[PDB]
Design a protein around this ligand. Structure first.
Ligand SMILES: FC(F)(F)Oc1ccc(-c2onc3ccc(-c4nnn[nH]4)cc23)cc1
Length: 236
């Protein structure tokens, strides 16, 4: 991700078939002639899409031009959470499946994985960053406190941001409860809240979204478990 000062991000297409699939996803969703009520509703929860972009002198070099969801914040606290029971898609080989489950074998049990967080600390006037190893080290014992850490800001636990996150996730859950046409593997929720002394939840990362004729039960499971953890944190 490259943050552009104009309030967009440039995401370089991943190698094929992943990058091309993510392009086609955005193209289908934001199709100008699209009057599919499900897909029109979905736009609310995605970064706004500005189309394929490549440098003037390099047509080979493909990016997606997306809304920077953090742009309206002064000191954004950002957490990326991969959603679902399976990080591998319906067309994964035995090795690929093994690779993906190996990356985090608790995915079926938990239904989500913290990919990373960036948390502004008022007292320090500085950022605390967690990488992929943080979330992958979280067990069932430690997942609540693992998530809680994101909301330690402003000399307190930010229960306001926790509550807001629940309410916004619930809207995304409601969308998933009323669509049977897309299944989402290895996609994320991007959480943002304001860390400054003076909330966004968006769906991102669509290299493994596939047509379906059933409920995306793994994604729903993830959302519901995430909501339950967040709910529990409100009792801290
Ligand atoms: F550390 C930091 F770079 F600042 O953290 C940041 C800052 C900004 C974003 C961010 O903002 N709007 C986004 C829209 C899409 C994506 C995206 N799509 N697929 N993969 N990532 C990321 C987006 C993400 C992380």
């Amino acid at each position: 991700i490259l943050q552009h000062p104009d309030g967009t991000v440039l995401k370089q297409l991943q190698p094929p078939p992943r990058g091309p699939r993510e392009l086609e996803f955005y193209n289908m969703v934001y199709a100008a002639d699209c009057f599919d009520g499900v897909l029109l509703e979905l736009r609310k929860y995605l970064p706004k899409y500005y189309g394929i972009w490549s440098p003037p002198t390099a047509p080979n070099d493909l990016y997606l031009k997306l809304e920077d969801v953090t742009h309206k914040f002064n000191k954004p606290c950002i957490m990326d959470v991969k959603i679902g029971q399976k990080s591998y898609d319906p067309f994964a080989s035995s090795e690929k499946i093994q690779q993906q489950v190996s990356k985090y074998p608790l995915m079926e049990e938990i239904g989500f994985l913290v990919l990373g967080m960036r948390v502004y600390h008022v007292h320090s006037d500085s950022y605390e960053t967690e990488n992929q190893h943080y979330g992958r080290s979280l067990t069932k014992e430690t997942i609540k406190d693992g998530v809680s850490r994101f909301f330690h800001n402003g000399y307190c636990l930010r229960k306001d941001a926790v509550a807001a996150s629940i309410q916004k996730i619930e809207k995304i859950l409601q969308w998933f409860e009323n669509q049977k046409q897309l299944n989402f593997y290895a996609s994320s929720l991007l959480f943002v809240y304001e860390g400054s002394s003076q909330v966004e939840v968006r769906m991102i990362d669509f290299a493994h979204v596939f047509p379906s004729n059933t409920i995306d039960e793994g994604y729903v499971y993830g959302l519901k478990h995430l909501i339950s953890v967040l709910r529990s944190i409100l009792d801290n």
